[PDB]
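fwd from M.: "can u put these together and see what the complex looks like"

so here's what she sent:
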Amino acid sequence: FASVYAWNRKRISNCVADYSVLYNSASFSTFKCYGVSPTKLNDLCFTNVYADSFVIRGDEVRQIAPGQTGKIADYNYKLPDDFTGCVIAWNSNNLDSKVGGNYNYLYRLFRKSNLKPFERDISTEIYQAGSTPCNGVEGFNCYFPLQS
Amino acid sequence: QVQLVQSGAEVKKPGASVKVSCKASGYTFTSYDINWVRQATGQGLEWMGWMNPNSGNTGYAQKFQGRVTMTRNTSISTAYMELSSLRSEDTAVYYCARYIVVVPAAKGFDPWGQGTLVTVSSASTKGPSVFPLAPSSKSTSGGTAALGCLVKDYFPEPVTVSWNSGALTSGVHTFPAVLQSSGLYSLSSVVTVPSSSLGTQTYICNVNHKPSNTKVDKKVEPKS
Amino acid sequence: QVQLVQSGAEVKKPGASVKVSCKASGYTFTSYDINWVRQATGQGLEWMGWMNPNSGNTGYAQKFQGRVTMTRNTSISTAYMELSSLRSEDTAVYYCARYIVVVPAAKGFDPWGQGTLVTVSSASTKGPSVFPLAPSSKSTSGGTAALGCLVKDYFPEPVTVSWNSGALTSGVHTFPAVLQSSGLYSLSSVVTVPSSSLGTQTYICNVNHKPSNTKVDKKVEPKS
Amino acid sequence: DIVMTQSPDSLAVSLGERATINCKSSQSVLYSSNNKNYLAWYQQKPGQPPKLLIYWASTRESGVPDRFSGSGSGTDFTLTISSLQAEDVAVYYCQQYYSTPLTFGGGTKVEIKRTVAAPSVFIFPPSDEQLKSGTASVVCLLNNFYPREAKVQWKVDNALQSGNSQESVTEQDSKDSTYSLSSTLTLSKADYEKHKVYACEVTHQGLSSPVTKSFNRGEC
Amino acid sequence: DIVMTQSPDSLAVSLGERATINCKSSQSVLYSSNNKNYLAWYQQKPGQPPKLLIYWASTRESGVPDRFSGSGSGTDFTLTISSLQAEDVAVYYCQQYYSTPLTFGGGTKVEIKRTVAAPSVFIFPPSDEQLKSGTASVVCLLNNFYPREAKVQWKVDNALQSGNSQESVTEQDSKDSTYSLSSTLTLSKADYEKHKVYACEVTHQGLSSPVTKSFNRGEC
Ligand SMILES: *[C@@H]1O[C@H](CO)[C@@H](O[C@@H]2O[C@H](CO)[C@@H](O[C@@H]3O[C@H](CO)[C@@H](O)[C@H](O)[C@H]3NC(C)=O)[C@H](O)[C@H]2NC(C)=O)[C@H](O)[C@H]1NC(C)=O
Ligand SMILES: *[C@@H]1O[C@H](CO)[C@@H](O[C@@H]2O[C@H](CO)[C@@H](O[C@@H]3O[C@H](CO)[C@@H](O)[C@H](O)[C@H]3NC(C)=O)[C@H](O)[C@H]2NC(C)=O)[C@H](O)[C@H]1NC(C)=O
């Protein structure tokens, strides 16, 4: 999969989409639909479907929803307030977690200002907490902005 | 959970070295700077922040330089501190704290270590000498009179004196131990009891010295 | 802009008369009443409001009556005040203020004059007499010792004494001048300096009397 | 008629404190529905013209931060500055309005933390130049000291001297919030030459018993 | 560099009061528009690690009820706990932030209502067991007492004894808000046996004149 601070973005396009194989697969731990209840998806047509992908903790799946707050929805991935799609989530302990700790899945924990909806930020500048210029070096009130 | 676990309440001789540990939990560890402080007996604090999750250059307080060394392990996230060439006045208590941050600017220290003890002094360890301070008319006034137990000359700071195996909680007051020029501690615990009851009931002070294994019960009776 | 400019810091002899000016700016002038106040040395104020933009009947404070006269000019909006028959205890400072108003009721005084000086006393003007007050063991205590300069017997109030042409700012403290029965002022300025440095460095008090043209430098050295 | 008696004086208290300055006489509620008040608060820095603070008694501060904060009623009221900070050391008068004149008096300085402290004392004999002129000034200096309520007793040959001295005192120091005092004893050359020991005995709260600095006329 | 001098100390005042603890040095407003502050307030229970109170100077209490309430400005500020209640008896430090180190000191106890009270005094001669060992401890106890500013003067045969005593004092009592004090005089057996009257003279505000408890070495 893809990190949480640089999510992916696939633009599904002209095709025959069958959201029933999704809806009834029973392998998903969370399948919420917001603009439109799930059973009526296989009876409507749009212009574009986007699919974003990433990996988070287990109890941060409640911040992937319109109108939430927290380190994920504030500055990692923000959903607009009139969302239309659906959110799907499933546990993946056996694939992504490895003995000794899988330190390849990072997230951003400091930013100047919360994200605009569907905005993305992969920069890696030293977060300047204190007025003292960080000069690009760590220290008190000068923090690296990514945690794992 | 948000915790900090220290260990190593110990005693050293002057001109030596010591390593002190702080175990963390309930966090990513390498994400918040560890800061230690000194605290004497009834004084202020010091020691500026330093050290970081990753590598971390580490800082100092500029009067503690050279003697101070900061080492940690990415095996569980346990920060330490190595002091060297102790001079028998750095005897104090030493703390740990996570120094949590939040968007704008970190706000004070997140948690707070349980503290530890380092006692420096060429004494090693010695047991207490106990005397009973008898109730007397010079201590008697009207309805009540006071009696107690004097437990003196011991190095290993944690010592306890109870009254009647923990029975009397009224008037029982143990005073802070005093550190003499000899280098050994001393204290006295006193309790008041109705003057009609000078010798009548049991008043036996139970002295226990935990670093050693001293346990002695001494009865206090009015003066002959 | 909102300003008030006074002028006329001067000296009079008793049984005389004086006129004092307040220049205004940044306003329509004839629209806000001018009010003057007295102020002695470290005291309160007085003098009730009076006078108006147009014509203005003008008021008084009923213990100042007859001696008080208020004249202005519509050529620029400059209010004045004429006092007469001075009695050598009306020596004070005198102010101006615009007393601004707003719909409901005016709220305190708008601006505030820079103040002025009137000194009444049959003295005319005299220069200061200077002595150096030597550093001594009776002034010495441990690490520091104090030395200074006594500048006495002068009428023209504004006088200044500096230390080493303005060099020493540590411990230099000039005390408020005192007014004797003779009618002349006097003061003494003292500075402390390490007792290891009694005579070592330069300590020369620079006395300048601005109404006159007196300028004298006096060195202070330990007692013989 | 209307006297603005202000009770407290010299509130030399640690910065940040919350002073409470009260005064009243002979109410000026002023009818006309304009039920507001009638009196402003003032601030005059030493060696400066006054300034304006809370007016109408109605918190109506102008270019003035919030810590300075008024109150009001019909006859009684208070200024009550909060979180006091350095440079608020001034003298704070009141007003009267439709009355006629004014009336008020107040101020502060410091307090510190350490003991009541104590003055350095120093006595200076008259300079040889002045004894030529025919007069003797004998200066006694009291250096740095919080409690200004100090006493300076001159003694000449152990006789307490009354009515030939003058004192003055400095403004509270902006750095260490202390006060310094200079007392001058003035004698004729003739009368100076009639006695031997000149002494200056200072009493103060930071002294357990008074300190005397003294010299002996004519002893190098 | 930046010294956090705190003025008040031991505010042992009746519960519910409104303490006001001030401190300042060398402002830390911290630019970056983040015009907030830079220093937290702390609470350390006796025999306990510290805890966190108001931070940013901005009332930002965490799991902390409202009575504990901060304030702030550029250089000066105050904690100002309201409606104080039992179990707020602690030591209250400050901070510095970007500075480097810290600095602060404060606390409270009680006050009561009745008179200034007074200590029960009691003197204990050395036990016969200790005189075998070759040393004599002479203990003097002062029981319950608000004003801790008590004086213990030892006298041996009416000679005031200096430099062979040690005192310690208890924490303010959680029930009756009093303090208890123990002074120990230490002598050799040899020097003990050279004098007769051992006396302990206690001075205190609740005593109109000092109380002496004394014994006579060797009198059953
Ligand atoms: C800090 O992290 C270290 C790893 O980076 C930890 O290190 C290892 O500790 C083991 C004990 O738990 C040692 O074990 C065995 O040691 C014996 C005797 O030396 C050998 O015969 C064995 O071969 C050895 N076995 C193995 C598989 O280790 C390791 O020697 C030691 N090795 C490393 C990697 O350093 C530290 O324990 C840890 N310390 C703290 C305080 O966290
Ligand atoms: C208050 O307002 C007055 C006008 O109402 C001002 O008055 C005039 O001041 C002039 C000086 O600037 C005088 O000037 C000249 O004076 C000489 C000598 O007296 C004469 O020879 C000239 O003829 C004369 N010239 C002219 C054209 O004025 C005026 O005499 C004088 N006249 C008036 C109108 O009073 C005041 O100066 C002003 N004062 C203040 C403090 O504002």
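replying to her w this: Chain E touches chain B through 50 residues (CB under 8 Å).
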